[PDB]
Amino acid sequence: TPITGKVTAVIGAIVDVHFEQSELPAILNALEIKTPQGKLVLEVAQHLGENTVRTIAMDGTEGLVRGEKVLDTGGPISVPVGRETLGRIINVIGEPIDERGPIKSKLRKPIHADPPSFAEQSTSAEILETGIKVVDLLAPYARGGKIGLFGGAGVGKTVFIQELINNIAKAHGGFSVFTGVGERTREGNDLYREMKETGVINLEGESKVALVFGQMNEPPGARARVALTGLTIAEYFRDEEGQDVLLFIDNIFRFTQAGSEVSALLGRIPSAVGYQPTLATDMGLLQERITTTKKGSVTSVQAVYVPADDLTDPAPATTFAHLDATTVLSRGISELGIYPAVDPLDSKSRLLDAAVVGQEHYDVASKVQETLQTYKSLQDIIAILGMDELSEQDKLTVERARKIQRFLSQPFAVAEVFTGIPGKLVRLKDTVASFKAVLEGKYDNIPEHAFYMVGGIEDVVAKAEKLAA
Amino acid sequence: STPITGKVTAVIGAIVDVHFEQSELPAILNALEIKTPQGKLVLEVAQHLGENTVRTIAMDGTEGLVRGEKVLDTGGPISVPVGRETLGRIINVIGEPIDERGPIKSKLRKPIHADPPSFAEQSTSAEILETGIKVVDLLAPYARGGKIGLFGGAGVGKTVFIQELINNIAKAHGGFSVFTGVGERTREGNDLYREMKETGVINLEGESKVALVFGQMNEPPGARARVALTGLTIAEYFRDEEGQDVLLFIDNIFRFTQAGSEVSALLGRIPSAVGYQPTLATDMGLLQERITTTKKGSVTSVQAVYVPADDLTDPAPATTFAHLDATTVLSRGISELGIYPAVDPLDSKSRLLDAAVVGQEHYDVASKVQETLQTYKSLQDIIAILGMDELSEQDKLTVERARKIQRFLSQPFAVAEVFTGIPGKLVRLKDTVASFKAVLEGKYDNIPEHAFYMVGGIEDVVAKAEKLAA
Amino acid sequence: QGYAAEISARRNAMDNASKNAGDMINRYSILYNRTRQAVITNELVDIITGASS
Amino acid sequence: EVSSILEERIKGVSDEANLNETGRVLAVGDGIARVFGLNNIQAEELVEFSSGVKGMALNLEPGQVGIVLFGSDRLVKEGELVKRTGNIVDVPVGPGLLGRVVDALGNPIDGKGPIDAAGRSRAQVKAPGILPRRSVHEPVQTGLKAVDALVPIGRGQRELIIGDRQTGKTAVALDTILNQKRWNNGSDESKKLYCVYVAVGQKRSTVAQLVQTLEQHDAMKYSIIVAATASEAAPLQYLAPFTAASIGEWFRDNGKHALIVYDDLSKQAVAYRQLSLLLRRPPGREAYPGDVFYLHSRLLERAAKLSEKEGSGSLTALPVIETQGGDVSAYIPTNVISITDGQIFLEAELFYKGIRPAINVGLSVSRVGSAAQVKALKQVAGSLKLFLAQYREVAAFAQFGSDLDASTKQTLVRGERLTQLLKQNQYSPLATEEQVPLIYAGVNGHLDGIELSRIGEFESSFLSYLKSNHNELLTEIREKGELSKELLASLKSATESFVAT
């Protein structure tokens, strides 16, 4: 628009501008303030009345002189999408961070999207395997699924996610997006390295991945819109090409978190627990722009960082409504020498049923939950007394439950070095057989260290010999 | 002060601000009436904000309000009707019936802001109520002139309890009762209306022995609040001018509390600890203080209270614990075991438990009952952990006397011919003291536990023995 | 013989319990104190939110 | 084709009349705005923004009137004029909402064409009187043997389903709706339910699975699905219970019964929090509004049974409150408990224990007692309540390793069998005729001769036994709905002939 103005204020990353022309502005516009940083791109989020707009600031706020000229772009920022975004890493505004220079496109689209309707909905009930024993039996995923992960980071989240990439994107091979919201820069480089080595990113060709990286160094505003940027790319894939995609995020708590910082400033009074009053509306849009449509479907794996490792907080809690399946991970179990650290009693899926992933799957999975739970209820008793001061029927359950517990592990193929055990991969079909077996009492009569750091039933047997000698 | 015309300036839900013309405003606590396409909207004036701007609490449903819509001033407070002819009749916040009896038959009208009676007028309570409910009579005696309190949590049979007391005592006495419902459901109101017309207590020919004030939760938080005030004023007319003792009831009194908390926040006031009003103390006091024994007549409330999650570290129930003379707890557990009433009598304390009020004999029997039961409750952990160890013949005999007593607390009720189908029994004060005395002495330690199940007096235990024999 | 060794087992076990239970008491006490304190902080946040509006 | 649709629309558009109000937008963004002016504005009335947005108006001030936008805020600009529609918010009600999804405002989002309108109604109607109400006697079941058996489910009552998020909170409701097939088919409409399911704060994909479930089991033909997904505006999530209640109320007026599911009120509350703080007016406890109680209580007292000078209808309510990492003493949870007349508490731990559908019988209460269980079903569950309440004390003592007498272990042995009988498979309808036989067996001590693992094997087989031989016993129960002398004997003999397996 030829609307010009000057900068009244510059309070943190939430600059306010005041338009000297009576031509009136619109919500979700963008303004460029000419900076010695080249230029700074900002986004109107509020109009406060009297032509004093309030704008979110993506990049730095060192250099912004007060009463400095603007020109109003007149609309939302459009990123660049295509198949010429594959093998490039793009910043929020579009810029290469891997420096293969300007990003090519056929279509450049607004960041924001309008979430699909009830009419555009389609359904799924497919079976997707990671190949992880605990995930498959107790919480099976599907094709187009939305998955949720929880508990803190710097404890194996990165590795866990890296491993999910290592399985699902090579059992698919089509288009994929990695979008990293408030990514830890030293790790981000390990993904870049890891991918090129494992043949994913290929830059003497075109990759089977496209990428978005936003670091946690960056002002709150940029961190909020890393995610929306990423989604524009995934929608391109979903819609224009007509093909199903992947999405991985480590962590999406950051979307929430960054929005919480900017809220206080914007005019908004923040709710109790210091979380923005707008969590609901932002969540609602994101989780419905990753959704199973008539065209494609974006099967997504989401990592939430939880503060104090409490779900009682409203930010993690409001997310559960929009997730078909969860696999809650708790730091303590990671400490115990068990990987994956996913809790087996604090896991759920809406696709674990007696005809969805079959009846055998359900009976095995049911039994493990019943066995472990009873054991959980008796943990007080077992420690204050002994383990023959228990009633007899229970003695069988307790002993059975202990074997399952050591069994749950499955060394990772991406952290094979760090565990100090080779990476193990086993089928959903191999896993159903292996859990079945333990429950039958077939190889129940052998040490608890035998089931300790090993994948399926087969590995257990091989190790009894190792201890025996 | 006097009738004037003001125009609405701001509608913020229940909260309504008016901007009356210069030098002309109503005084605090008045009633403004505003023409609305839904009855007559009554606004209660609660502040002055300067330049002749008042801020009000709604008494009738808000919807379709224009800023600029004329507001008259009555010149005085919300004025209800009172009388010995409003007995059976139903009255709400604006004194209209909701079972469509049209305009109330009024002898007199009165304000709901009645300042409390003073210390000169006081008299010392010596008249003794009987409820005819054994567990209540023996372990927390009520006295007529009292301020009884039916503490309990959620869904614990409070309504069923109130229903038995009103069915029995109101007819018995030559006094009045006014039954007041603060913010309670239209399922309950319709049950409370139906059951008490049937029994002959409320009757359309003749003068009803218990009046009704139904204030219900579909109405505003403001409108719900001053329902309690409405009932009280009827009891006050009875106390004073008619010169008759009252046997008051209010139901549930946490609804009263909750409403004031809500409106504290809307008026802009700063909330206190655990989301409670800063004005919590004084509001309970105002109502409780009006309900008192004067040389005019008594007023005796029996008040249901909702106690979130059987929790009393929560400040709103704990403050209320002070005001109420002869507490009882309706524990959730007692009801489920099949024991009616739901009263747990080792958590009920009364201040009306002396030893020359109720005689020495009453106090002493109940004391033994308290100990006998509590030693048995103490031994439960002991069997739980140790097994059959660390016991004695003395313990065995106490365990046995207590289980005979434990199943000797159940008294069927007529107003639970709808819950279990077991019809009522009435047990005199002197009669309960005797029958409990007999068991303690161990003359009825030869009659099985289930032969004290759903009995009254002593005759009843002997008769329930024959049934089990036969 | 059996009967003395039985009272002895009973003796070893109820003595051990008092120690294990001690360790659990200490652990819920740190948890108790902290959970009481966490609640006071949370009540202060609520007041702030009110006052701002 | 496409040329014709667009040309009709141009004909269908434009040409506005002389306006009688104005006001100029200033503050604006978040789905929320504030205008300067407006002296004819009513509270709750609809104001038409010249961008294509409509926003209802909830706060008026002699400064700046707060009209909360519905529409996308990106369309809205400042300095625009707004025009009062001049009507408070209303929805068309009619029998053309049968087997179709409609949103917040009452237009179809499932693309099944225009609805059939026989009236309009308003979202606020409020509770009927004491005289036009009668008491609830009206049997109804949920297709969960446990729930029916332990707590008295009625038609015209309000029962609050409470417990942790995503424990098949929705799934519990879906079993009831499936089981509401049985009465709908029956000829009489004085039985029929036209169930209305309200879904607030849920993703579009959750709703889309649920409609497939309903049609597959041939239960979508009386059901209505009202929606307000989590992206869609803070007013529209607030308006979703109130307009569901007006749809429900039309059946009531006609003298037909229906049932309203409010899943979740907890997320309605969260919306209203966002709304109240962006009209910058004080909230109550924990940032949730001060007038949040007014919302749940008014709504809830409208699902009411009617007397015989009226339709003799009754809308039934089931609230659902998901407690975020538990907490029953949290402000929205506490308020609703007080308003409801019963609780059907769902406990999370028991789910892993294998007691699905999960319930905990102490946390579930009935204040006024049984009065809406089928009379047959009352007779059999007579001591079921006393057993299970006792089992809980005895079991806790029993597993310690201590010594027990035979008397205490009759409770343990008896309870274990009873609990195992309760277990049922989700998405499986059930009938009175097939819950009366099973409770008899359990109470009258014929499930102790049968081993604990094969109690489940037994159930399916016992009912089959009856189809071939004692098919007369089942028919008497369906037809008379009570057990007399003869029926007790007949059944006592029916249990005996097949106790094996």
* C51–B273 C-beta distance less than 8 A: no
**Taking CA A141 as the corner, what is the angle to CA A140 and CA A146, rounded to the nearest 5 degrees?**
135
Exposure of A388 by Cβ count < 10 A (0-12 exposed, 13-18 middle, 19+ buried)?
Answer: exposed
Output DSSP code: residue D454.
G
Number of structural domains in chain B: 3
Where do the H-state alpha helices sit in B212-279? 221-225, 227-237, 254-266
- Which of D207, D173, D198, D172 shows the shortest CA–CA distance to D265? D198
Q: Could you please state the CATH topology (level 3) that the domain comprising C14-53 is classified under.
A: Helix Hairpins (1.10.287)
**The pair of three-digit structure tokens given for residue D362, joined into one six-digit string:** 């102490």
Using a CB-CB cut-off of 8 Å, the residues of chain D touching C46 are: 285-287
* A272–C46 C-beta distance less than 8 A: yes
- Search chain D and give the residue with CA nearest C48: D287
d(CA D58, CA B16): 13
DSSP secondary structure of D310-366 = S---EEEEEEEEEETTS-SSSHHHHHHHHHSSEE----SHHHHTT--S---TTTS-B
The answer to whether the CB of B363 falls within 8 A of the CB of D378 is: no
Cα B366 to the center of its chain, rounded Å? 25
d(CA B416, CA B161): 9
Cis peptide before D282, with omega less than 30 degrees from 0? no
Residues on C contacting B at a C-beta cutoff of 8 Å: 43, 46-47, 50-51
**The pair of three-digit structure tokens given for residue A255, joined into one six-digit string:** 């979307």
Cis peptide before D357, with omega less than 30 degrees from 0? yes
d(CA A229, CA A78): 9
d(CA A248, CA A122): 22
- Which of A242, A241, A234, A250 shows the shortest CA–CA distance to A291? A234
**Taking CA D116 as the corner, what is the angle to CA D110 and CA D121, rounded to the nearest 5 degrees?**
100
d(CA B58, CA B84): 29
For residue D159, the tally of other CB atoms under 10 A from its CB is: 22
The answer to whether the CB of D341 falls within 8 A of the CB of D158 is: yes
The answer to whether the CB of D98 falls within 8 A of the CB of D194 is: yes
d(CA D64, CA D402): 73
- Choosing from A108, A109, A143, A184, the catalytic residue is A184
**Taking CA D216 as the corner, what is the angle to CA D215 and CA D222, rounded to the nearest 5 degrees?**
30
Question: Which CATH number do you get for residue B333?
Answer: 3.40.50.300
d(CA D250, CA A145): 39
**The pair of three-digit structure tokens given for residue B368, joined into one six-digit string:** 């033994």
Domain end among A308, A331, A351: A351
Output DSSP code: residue D147.
H
Catalytic residues of D: 367
- Which of B252, B285, B228, B247 shows the shortest CA–CA distance to B152? B252
* D101–A312 C-beta distance less than 8 A: no
For residue A430, the tally of other CB atoms under 10 A from its CB is: 16
**The pair of three-digit structure tokens given for residue A281, joined into one six-digit string:** 């509306």
The answer to whether the CB of A177 falls within 8 A of the CB of A210 is: yes
For residue D210, the tally of other CB atoms under 10 A from its CB is: 22
Q: Tell me the CA distances in angstroms from A393 to A387, A390, D125, one per residue in order.
A: 12, 9, 59
For chain D, state the CA radius of gyration: 26
Give the β-pairing of A177-183 and A78-81: unpaired
**Looking at the structure, do residues A198 and A60 belong to the same domain, yes or no?**
no
Beta-bridge partners for D120:
D92
Place of tokens 């400490």: A335
- Determined by cryo-EM
d(CA A96, CA A90): 5
The answer to whether the CB of B421 falls within 8 A of the CB of B431 is: no
d(CA B256, CA B184): 10
**The pair of three-digit structure tokens given for residue A87, joined into one six-digit string:** 């093998």
- Choosing from B158, B224, B226, B407, the catalytic residue is B158
d(CA B379, CA B395): 8
For residue C18, the tally of other CB atoms under 10 A from its CB is: 9
Domain end among A333, A351, A369: A351
Give every CB contact of residue D181 below 8 A, 6+ residues apart in sequence: D217, D218, D219, D429
Domains, chain D, in order of start with CATH, read 15-87 (2.40.30.20), 88-373 (3.40.50.300), 374-501 (1.20.150.20)
User: Which bin fits A270, alpha (ψ -120 to 50), beta or left (φ > 0)?
Assistant: beta
Composition of chain B by helix, strand, coil, percent to 5 = 35, 20, 45
d(CA D153, CA B276): 34
Domain end among A325, A351, A377: A351
- Choosing from B35, B67, B185, B351, the catalytic residue is B185
**Looking at the structure, do residues A70 and A84 belong to the same domain, yes or no?**
no
What's phi and psi for D496, nearest 5 deg? -60, -40
Q: Which amino acid is at A376?
A: K
Where do the H-state alpha helices sit in B321-392? 332-336, 359-385
The answer to whether the CB of D356 falls within 8 A of the CB of A362 is: no
SS (H, E, C) B299-336: EEEEEEEECHHHCCCCHHHHHHCCCCCEEEEECHHHHH
Instruction: Please tell me whether residue B243 adopts helix, strand or coil conformation.
Output: coil
**Looking at the structure, do residues A42 and A157 belong to the same domain, yes or no?**
no
**Looking at the structure, do residues B347 and B463 belong to the same domain, yes or no?**
no
d(CA B77, CA A85): 74
Q: Tell me the CA distances in angstroms from A343 to A326, A329, A414, D327, one per residue in order.
A: 10, 6, 21, 22
From the CB coordinates, do chains D and A have 3 or more pairs under 8 Å? yes
B154 carries a ligand binding annotation? yes
d(CA D264, CA A151): 26
Beta-bridge partners for B82:
B108
Mutate to test the interface with D, among C10, C42, C46, C52 (most CBs of D within 10 A): C46
Describe the strand order of the beta sheet including A210-215 as a list of residue ranges: A89-90, A210-215, A177-183
Composition of chain C by helix, strand, coil, percent to 5 = 95, 0, 5
| Beta-carbon-side half-sphere exposure of residue B120 (alpha carbons within 13 Å) | 0
Give every CB contact of residue D365 below 8 A, 6+ residues apart in sequence: B154, B155, B156, B332, D342, D343
Cα A347 to the center of its chain, rounded Å? 17
Q: Tell me the CA distances in angstroms from D171 to D175, D176, D206, D320, D467, one per residue in order.
A: 6, 9, 11, 12, 30
d(CA A98, CA A82): 18
**Looking at the structure, do residues B30 and B155 belong to the same domain, yes or no?**
no
Instruction: Please tell me whether residue A203 adopts helix, strand or coil conformation.
Output: coil
**Looking at the structure, do residues A241 and A133 belong to the same domain, yes or no?**
yes
Residues on C contacting D at a C-beta cutoff of 8 Å: 46, 49-50, 53
**The pair of three-digit structure tokens given for residue D68, joined into one six-digit string:** 């909360």
d(CA A458, CA A451): 10
Q: Tell me the CA distances in angstroms from A170 to A130, A174, A208, B457, one per residue in order.
A: 11, 9, 9, 83
**Looking at the structure, do residues A166 and A94 belong to the same domain, yes or no?**
yes
- Which of B369, B364, B337, B339 shows the shortest CA–CA distance to B353? B364
- Which of B198, B128, B154 shows the shortest CA–CA distance to B414? B198
d(CA D196, CA D240): 11
For residue B267, the tally of other CB atoms under 10 A from its CB is: 16
For residue B201, the tally of other CB atoms under 10 A from its CB is: 20
Interchain contact B356–C (C-beta under 8 A): no
- Which of A15, A17, A112 shows the shortest CA–CA distance to A71? A17
Describe the strand order of the beta sheet including A146-149 as a list of residue ranges: A245-250, A298-303, A146-149, A325-329, A342-349
The partner residue sitting opposite D42, judged by closest CB among B64, B314, B416, is B64
Cis peptide before A340, with omega less than 30 degrees from 0? yes
Give every CB contact of residue A138 below 8 A, 6+ residues apart in sequence: A344, A347, A349, A352, A365, A368, A369
**Looking at the structure, do residues A230 and A149 belong to the same domain, yes or no?**
yes
Nearest chain D CA: its distance from B342 CA (Å): 11
Give the neighbours of chain C: at least 3 Cβ pairs within 8 Å.
A, B, D
Place of tokens 């003073």: B118
The answer to whether the CB of D72 falls within 8 A of the CB of D52 is: no
D165 carries a ligand binding annotation? yes
**Looking at the structure, do residues B88 and B48 belong to the same domain, yes or no?**
no
**Looking at the structure, do residues A331 and A393 belong to the same domain, yes or no?**
no
Nearest chain B CA: its distance from C1 CA (Å): 20
Question: Which CATH number do you get for residue B380?
Answer: 1.10.1140.10
Place of tokens 């801020």: B55
If you count them, how many residues does chain B have? 470
Nearest chain A CA: its distance from C46 CA (Å): 6
Instruction: Please tell me whether residue D281 adopts helix, strand or coil conformation.
Output: coil
Chain breaks in chain A (C to N over 2.5 A) after: none
Q: Where are the beta strands (DSSP E) in B49-115?
A: 53-58, 70-73, 79-82, 108-111
**Looking at the structure, do residues A40 and A101 belong to the same domain, yes or no?**
no
Q: Which amino acid is at D419?
A: T
Q: Where are the beta strands (DSSP E) in D127-182?
A: 159-164
What domain range is B384 assigned to? 353-470
Interchain contact D290–C (C-beta under 8 A): no
Q: Tell me the CA distances in angstroms from D361 to A169, D70, D424, one per residue in order.
A: 48, 43, 17
d(CA B244, CA B250): 19
d(CA D476, CA D433): 9
Which value, to the nearest 10 degrees, does the dihedral of the CA atoms of residues B266, B267, B270, B274 take? -40
**Looking at the structure, do residues B36 and B157 belong to the same domain, yes or no?**
no
The H or E element spanning position A229 is: helix A226-236
Beta-bridge partners for B57:
B44
Place of tokens 């417990």: D163
Question: Which CATH number do you get for residue B20?
Answer: 2.40.10.170
d(CA B213, CA B322): 26
Which value, to the nearest 10 degrees, does the dihedral of the CA atoms of residues B259, B265, B270, B274 take? 50
Cα D32 to the center of its chain, rounded Å? 30
* C50–B271 C-beta distance less than 8 A: yes
Using a CB-CB cut-off of 8 Å, the residues of chain A touching D25 are: 49
B322-353 as b/e, with b when 16 or more CB fall inside 10 Å? ebbbbbbbbbbebbbbebbbbbbbeebebebb
- The span from the first CA to the last CA of chain D, in angstroms, equals 67
